Amino acid sequence: PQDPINIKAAERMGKLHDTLKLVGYEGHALELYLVRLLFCLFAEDTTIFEKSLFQEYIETKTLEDGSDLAHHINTLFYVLNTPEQKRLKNLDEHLAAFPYINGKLFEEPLPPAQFDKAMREALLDLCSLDWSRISPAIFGSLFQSIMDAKKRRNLGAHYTSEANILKLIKPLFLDELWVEFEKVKNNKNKLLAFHKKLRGLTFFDPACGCGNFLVITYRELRLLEIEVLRGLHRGGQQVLDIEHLIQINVDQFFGIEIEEFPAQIAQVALWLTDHQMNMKISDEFGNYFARIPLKSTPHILNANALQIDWNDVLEAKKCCFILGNPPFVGKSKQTPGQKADLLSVFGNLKSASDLDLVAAWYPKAAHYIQTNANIRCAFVSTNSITQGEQVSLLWPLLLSLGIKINFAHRTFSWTNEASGVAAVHCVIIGFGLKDSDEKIIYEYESINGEPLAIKAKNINPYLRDGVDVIACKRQQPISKLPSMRYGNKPTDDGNFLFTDEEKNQFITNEPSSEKYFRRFVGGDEFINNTSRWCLWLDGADISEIRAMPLVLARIKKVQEFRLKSSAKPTRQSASTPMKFFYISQPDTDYLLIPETSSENRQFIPIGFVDRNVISSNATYHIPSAEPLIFGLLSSTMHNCWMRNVGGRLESRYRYSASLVYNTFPWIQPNEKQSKAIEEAAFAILKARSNYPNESLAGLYDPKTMPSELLKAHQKLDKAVDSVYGFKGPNTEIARIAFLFETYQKMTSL
DNA sequence: TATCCGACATAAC
DNA sequence: GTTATGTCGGATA
Ligand SMILES: Nc1ncnc2c1ncn2[C@@H]1O[C@H](C[C@@H](N)CC[C@H](N)C(=O)O)[C@@H](O)[C@H]1O
Ligand SMILES: [Ca+2]
C-alpha cells in the first residue's frame, strides 16, 4: 500500500504552490488550481476516481520533461466539469474514465500553467502517497507553508489543533447534542424531530482560516448522524437506505477568511470530509453512498470580517453558533490597516487602540447576535484580553451590550502539529446574550496538561469566579502610598551598555572614561545578581566628552540608530544622543521592583539599590523608600493583587505601577502595626543576607527557598494581614475576593 | 513627559 | 530542539 501522508507532504505541496507562483502563475488561478489538484490527489486514493487514475494518466499520457503536463491538466479540469452526456463521442478513453464532479470547484475555466521535470516529479511524488486519511493537521500545515514568517505572524495564520477545537465545540453545542441523543434515541418520533433539528443547525467562523473548526464540527455531526440513522432504522435486517435518510451537509457551514488560499482550502476541506464520512457510513451499513457530483456547497467568503456586515454571509436569524480562532496581534505590532479596523469596531472609545486585534471580533459578534439571543459563541484568544490594561477597555463595552460569559478555559500553552509552532498562551471564551445557570470554568494544573471542569458561580471578565468589578489604570495611587516611577529607557541599540569585560577593555583603551560609567541593573541583572554597566552622560561636561573618541563613536552610533527609528519621538531623541531616551534616575537610594519575572515564585524578588546604580526600564522603583513599604510589596497580599489585576507575558508576572500599585487597596496602620511590619521587613532582609552567593532567584525559587526566609515572610504576612483585619482562609481565592471588597469600598469614595 | 505590551526573544540544558 | 524565564524599544497619550 501507499505511504499515508504526513505533515511533510503538505509542506511539499506548499512548495509546489510557491514554485508555480514564482513562474508567474499567481493569484486566484493559482489558489484554485492547487486546491483542484488537492481534490484530485484525494480522489484517486478513494473511490471517486478509479484507484490511481490521476497518477496513471500523468505517468502514461504526459511527457517526462513536463512540457505538456499543463495542457492535459487543463482538459482534465474541463472534463471533470462536463457531464457524460456532453462529452465528445471520440474523447480520449483515458480522459473519459474520470467522473463528472462539477460544483463551484470546477466551474471556472483557468489559464493553463506550465511545468518542467521537477514540478512534474513533485506532483507525481504527491500522487504516490495515500491522501485517504487527510485531517486538520494536513489542511493547517498546507495553509501555513505558503506564508512568509512576517506574514504568518501578522495575519495570525496559525491553524487550530483538533484538540483545541474539541475543547471549544464540546461545551458550545456538541456534548449537549449527545445527551439529547441518548435521551430520545429509543423514541422514533422524538428521534425524527432530533434529526430535523440537526439538519437546521448553522455554524459560522468569522476568521475561519483553512476551515478546521468547520471541518471538525461537520465530522462530529456526521458521526452523530450515523447513530441517529442507526436508531431510526425501521427495516430491521434490510440494508439501511442512506441517500433518502441522510440530511446533514456542507451547506450548513459559513466562514469569513481574508487570504484566498485558506478560503479555498476551507471549501475543499469540507467536501473531502464529506466524502470521508460518506465512505464511513457506507462501511457501517454496507451500501455505497457518495455525494458526487458536488451539488452542496459551503459558504466561505474571502473578505475582511471586520469591514463587512456578517449578515451578508449568513442572516443572524438563520444562524446558531459562532466559533473560531481569530488572529492575535498586539497593540504595538499591528499594521495601519488593522489599527483602523480595530478602531472602526470600537468607535471613539478611550485608549481602544491599546487592544489586541483579536478583541475586535467580540463587539462584532456582540452586535451581530443582538438580533437573535439564541446564538451561542466561543472564541480562542490570547490570554492577554483577560489581563492587565485590556480588561478595562474591552469588557465595559461587552457587558453593556448584554454579553454574558457562559464557559471559559483559563490560560493554556498553544501548540499544533505543524512547523514553527507559535509561542503564546491562550484562553477560550464562550459567551452570548443568555446567562447560563451552570457556568463551567476549565482549569489547568499543567499549562500543557488536560483541563479540569470546575463549577462556577460567575465568570469574571478576568475568567475568575467572582464579582464583576474591573481594576482600572490610574496615574496616582488610591491608597496613601509614595509614588512609583518607571526605570530609565535607553533606546541605544546597546551602544551605552557593557559587560564587565567590555567595561574593562573600553577603560584601558579610553582611561578618561571611568568617571562616566555607572552600574546598570535591569530585571534580569537584579534577580540574578549579574553585573552590567552603562555610560551615564546625563549632565556631562562637553569639554570632557570631546576629548574621548571611543565615547564619541558611541554617541554617534546612538544617533544613527535613533534616526533610523519609525517612532517620531525616537527620531526626535536622536538630537540628544548622549542622554537616555527616558530618564527617571532619582537622587536618593531606592526600592527596585523587576518588571517581568517568573510566575513560579510566590513573591516578586524586590530589594534596595544604591542611588548611583542606573535602573533600566525593565524595572520600577520607589525613591527613598522606608522599610515599611518594602514590607508591603513583599506581602502575600500585594503579590496576590499583582497576580490578579496585573498583566502577563505569556504567563510570567508583569508588574506595572498604574495597574497594580496604583489600584492596590491598603489601610494606613497604627504605630504598633507599622513597627510590626518594619520588624518583619528587617527579618526578611537579614534572612537574605545569611546566604552569600545566592542570587535573589536562588533564594526565591520555592523549591530551593531556605526555611529561614519563608518564616520571615510568614512573619510579614501575619503583620500585614493584621493591618487588614484579614482572618479568612489564607488562599488565593479568599485573598483576591477580599482585596476586591476593599478596592470597591475605596473606589466608591 | 510616560509607559504596557509582545501568535516573543534568547541564553541556557 | 526543548526549557526556563526576562530584553528592548514601538506606538500612543
Ligand atoms: N480581518 C480579518 N478578517 C478575516 N480573516 C482574517 C482577518 N485577519 C486575519 N484573518 C485570518 O484569521 C485566521 C486566524 C487563524 N488562527 C485561523 C486558523 C483556523 N482557525 C484554522 O484552524 O486553520 C488567519 O487565517 C487569517 O487569514
Ligand atoms: Ca495516491
Side-chain angles (χ1 to χ4, degrees), chain A residues 1-7 9-14 16-25 27-84 86-147 149 151-160 162-175 177-195 197-233 235-236 238-242 244 246-279 281-294 296-314 316 319-343 345-347 349-375 377-380 382-403 405-412 414-444 449 451-456 458-474 477-479 481-500 502 504 506-511 516-520 522-530 532-540 542-545 547-554 556-586 589-601 603-623 625 627-628 630-633 635-666 669-670 673 676-678 680-685 687-688 690-702 705-710 712-714 716-726 728-729 731-735 737-740 742-744 746:
Chain A
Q2 299 188 324
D3 295 347
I5 47 140
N6 50 39
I7 307 300
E11 288 171 1
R12 261 180 273 121
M13 166 155 258
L16 178 66
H17 165 291
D18 292 336
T19 310
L20 265 163
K21 185 171 69 118
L22 287 198
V23 313
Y25 200 91
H28 179 67
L30 177 66
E31 321 304 353
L32 172 49
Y33 202 96
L34 200 84
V35 117
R36 282 163 172 206
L37 298 165
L38 182 60
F39 173 97
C40 289
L41 293 166
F42 172 82
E44 64 182 341
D45 283 346
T46 303
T47 51
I48 298 182
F49 306 170
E50 292 179 41
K51 199 145 192 184
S52 290
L53 201 73
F54 187 44
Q55 178 180 331
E56 289 159 27
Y57 185 98
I58 304 179
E59 290 172 350
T60 65
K61 295 227 83 162
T62 284
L63 281 191
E64 174 198 356
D65 58 341
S67 62
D68 70 337
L69 172 62
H71 315 322
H72 289 251
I73 289 187
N74 194 263
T75 306
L76 176 57
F77 288 167
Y78 161 82
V79 168
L80 297 167
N81 203 38
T82 296
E84 309 212 315
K86 300 168 169 175
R87 293 164 184 200
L88 308 176
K89 308 176 170 85
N90 67 333
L91 189 55
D92 185 301
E93 277 165 10
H94 307 171
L95 288 162
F98 286 87
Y100 167 66
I101 304 281
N102 189 197
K104 197 190 164 187
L105 171 59
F106 282 98
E107 75 178 353
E108 180 185 6
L110 279 178
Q114 183 64 335
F115 287 85
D116 64 348
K117 186 156 170 295
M119 295 156 91
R120 184 168 164 273
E121 288 179 353
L123 181 59
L124 282 174
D125 215 279
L126 289 178
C127 292
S128 68
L129 307 178
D130 189 20
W131 293 75
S132 199
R133 303 279 184 199
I134 178 165
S135 38
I138 303 307
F139 297 108
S141 295
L142 173 62
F143 162 40
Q144 283 189 200
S145 82
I146 65 128
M147 299 208 10
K151 200 161 192 201
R152 269 189 57 164
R153 170 161 175 187
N154 168 257
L155 295 188
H158 287 114
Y159 97 81
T160 311
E162 197 162 305
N164 276 335
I165 301 176
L166 291 165
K167 339 155 127 177
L168 186 156
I169 66 182
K170 286 167 107 308
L172 194 53
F173 51 89
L174 184 51
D175 289 343
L177 290 181
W178 277 98
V179 169
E180 184 182 352
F181 175 61
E182 299 296 351
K183 182 161 57 173
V184 312
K185 140 180 77 188
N186 283 322
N187 175 327
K188 248 79 177 181
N189 222 48
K190 289 167 137 213
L191 201 50
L192 283 155
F194 184 73
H195 206 178
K197 196 227 270 184
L198 291 178
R199 175 59 180 145
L201 290 178
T202 52
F203 303 85
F204 190 6
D205 186 350
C208 72
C210 76
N212 278 324
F213 281 98
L214 301 174
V215 163
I216 299 299
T217 296
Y218 175 66
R219 154 160 81 63
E220 296 305 305
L221 256 61
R222 282 295 296 274
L223 285 184
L224 175 56
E225 197 206 34
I226 274 171
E227 300 315 315
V228 162
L229 294 172
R230 184 124 51 201
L232 284 186
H233 183 47
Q238 316 175 341
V239 58
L240 180 43
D241 179 33
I242 297 172
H244 302 331
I246 201 162
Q247 278 204 71
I248 295 164
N249 218 333
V250 299
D251 52 25
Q252 310 171 225
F253 297 83
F254 297 85
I256 306 163
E257 164 57 39
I258 197 168
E259 291 294 300
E260 162 153 19
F261 187 57
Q264 296 269 22
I265 312 181
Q267 195 169 99
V268 165
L270 274 161
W271 280 308
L272 311 182
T273 319
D274 178 74
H275 190 60
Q276 267 170 340
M277 296 310 302
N278 302 331
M279 285 319 308
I281 206 171
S282 287
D283 296 352
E284 294 299 323
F285 306 138
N287 57 332
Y288 188 87
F289 166 86
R291 286 163 155 162
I292 306 297
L294 299 170
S296 215
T297 77
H299 302 105
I300 310 301
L301 181 61
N302 175 203
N304 182 310
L306 301 190
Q307 287 178 5
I308 61 174
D309 188 10
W310 289 357
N311 288 285
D312 301 335
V313 184
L314 175 51
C319 162
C320 293
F321 308 89
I322 291 177
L323 40 82
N325 179 23
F328 311 167
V329 180
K331 60 159 169 191
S332 308
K333 307 308 211 267
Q334 31 176 261
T335 66
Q338 38 209 186
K339 299 169 195 132
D341 289 12
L342 179 57
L343 293 188
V345 168
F346 286 95
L349 173 60
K350 173 54 197 144
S351 293
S353 50
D354 286 338
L355 285 170
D356 200 287
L357 187 48
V358 65
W361 277 248
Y362 285 75
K364 269 296 211 182
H367 280 109
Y368 177 72
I369 68 176
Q370 213 67 59
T371 60
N372 171 9
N374 275 16
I375 298 168
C377 314
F379 283 143
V380 184
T382 163
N383 54 340
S384 263
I385 69 178
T386 59
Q387 307 164 359
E389 89 184 332
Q390 320 210 32
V391 190
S392 315
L393 309 174
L394 178 54
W395 292 98
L397 173 69
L398 285 192
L399 294 178
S400 81
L401 290 184
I403 294 290
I405 305 173
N406 291 307
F407 74 89
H409 285 248
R410 291 181 77 61
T411 296
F412 55 105
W414 173 270
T415 194
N416 67 31
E417 298 100 335
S419 76
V421 171
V424 55
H425 282 192
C426 293
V427 295
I428 303 176
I429 295 165
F431 63 99
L433 286 196
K434 309 167 155 202
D435 301 12
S436 203
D437 303 75
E438 297 225 283
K439 294 158 179 211
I440 65 212
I441 296 170
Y442 294 80
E443 308 190 279
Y444 296 70
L452 195 67
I454 291 314
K455 176 151 100 163
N458 179 41
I459 306 193
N460 259 158
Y462 305 91
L463 311 182
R464 287 185 297 254
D465 191 353
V467 310
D468 264 25
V469 167
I470 297 181
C472 304
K473 239 175 182 157
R474 307 190 85 246
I478 46 165
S479 291
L481 299 163
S483 306
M484 178 174 294
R485 304 270 292 171
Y486 191 55
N488 325 275
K489 171 172 164 180
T491 315
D492 74 340
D493 199 61
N495 295 113
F496 286 162
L497 315 168
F498 300 81
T499 72
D500 294 313
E502 293 160 340
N504 297 338
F506 189 92
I507 278 299
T508 80
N509 281 338
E510 181 78 38
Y516 291 123
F517 281 87
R518 285 197 172 166
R519 291 171 196 280
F520 187 72
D524 172 38
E525 280 78 31
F526 172 82
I527 281 159
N528 295 315
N529 214 43
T530 297
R532 225 177 162 190
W533 302 89
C534 67
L535 255 321
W536 185 254
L537 305 168
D538 194 43
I542 183 59
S543 76
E544 295 179 344
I545 284 192
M548 316 168 171
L550 283 200
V551 185
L552 237 19
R554 288 320 171 75
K556 181 142 195 57
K557 249 124 184 249
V558 171
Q559 174 162 88
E560 279 149 359
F561 166 89
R562 247 127 103 163
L563 290 164
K564 305 198 224 92
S565 183
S566 57
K568 188 163 83 184
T570 308
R571 291 195 298 278
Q572 290 187 344
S573 89
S575 62
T576 40
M578 38 182 260
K579 288 178 201 65
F580 277 23
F581 171 83
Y582 178 67
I583 292 191
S584 54
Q585 189 60 18
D589 302 12
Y590 56 92
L591 171 68
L592 192 159
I593 308 86
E595 193 232 33
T596 306
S597 60
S598 185
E599 64 287 21
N600 294 334
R601 303 201 191 97
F603 314 93
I604 295 188
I606 62 184
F608 288 99
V609 193
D610 181 272
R611 60 180 194 95
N612 274 319
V613 354
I614 300 295
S615 44
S616 134
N617 58 306
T619 69
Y620 286 75
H621 65 279
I622 299 189
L628 163 72
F630 170 87
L632 195 58
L633 312 187
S635 73
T636 287
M637 278 297 231
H638 177 63
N639 283 281
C640 169
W641 187 253
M642 173 276 301
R643 260 173 227 113
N644 280 277
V645 315
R648 307 277 178 114
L649 198 181
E650 272 191 332
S651 277
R652 337 275 159 274
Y653 305 150
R654 181 184 299 123
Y655 200 95
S656 78
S658 71
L659 276 167
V660 187
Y661 187 75
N662 287 343
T663 61
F664 180 55
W666 163 243
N670 297 112
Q673 289 178 317
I677 296 185
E678 297 171 348
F682 283 114
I684 289 169
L685 279 197
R688 282 167 179 193
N690 292 320
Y691 293 85
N693 71 272
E694 216 73 32
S695 81
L696 287 177
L699 277 153
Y700 278 74
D701 167 22
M705 171 172 195
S707 53
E708 185 200 348
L709 188 52
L710 180 55
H713 271 263
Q714 277 161 11
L716 189 255
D717 294 322
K718 186 219 214 75
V720 177
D721 294 338
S722 153
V723 177
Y724 278 72
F726 178 64
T731 65
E732 276 277 298
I733 300 257
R735 281 186 152 99
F738 176 96
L739 292 163
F740 269 86
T742 321
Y743 172 82
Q744 204 178 0
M746 294 183 151

